[PDB]
Write a protein that holds these residues in place. Structure first.
Motif: not given
Length: 109
Positions: A36-44, A59-64, A67-76
């Protein structure tokens, strides 16, 4: 056996009728795969990731993306990025393929 996978997409705000979703859903619905697949924002994204397995950022992201990658890194967690070409082209096959690839690969850090 009784198994399946869940892929999360970060781009839309959970709207009906989607290009990527359509293509992917088609390939899967045709291949007859339990996924299954779903699409949502970063907040949720943090609330859904708790259950989901793999995450994908559009693609196409300035700060999104920052933060995402900055959170995924540590979140592993298994996070994949969609190329401008693949995105603009809406290659469902490539999408689901990448997601599943990362899932099975199970990479971190």
């Amino acid at each position: 056996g009784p198994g399946s996978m869940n892929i999360l997409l970060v781009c839309g705000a959970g709207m009906s009728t989607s290009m990527l979703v359509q293509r992917i859903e088609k390939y899967a619905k045709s291949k007859n795969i339990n996924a299954t697949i779903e699409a949502i924002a970063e907040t949720r994204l943090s609330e859904v990731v708790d259950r989901f397995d793999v995450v994908l950022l559009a693609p196409q992201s300035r700060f999104n993306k920052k933060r995402l990658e900055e959170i995924t890194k540590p979140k592993g967690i298994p996070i994949e990025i969609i190329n401008t070409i693949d995105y603009g082209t809406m290659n469902g096959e490539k999408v689901l393929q990448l997601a599943i690839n990362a899932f099975n690969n199970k990479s971190s850090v």
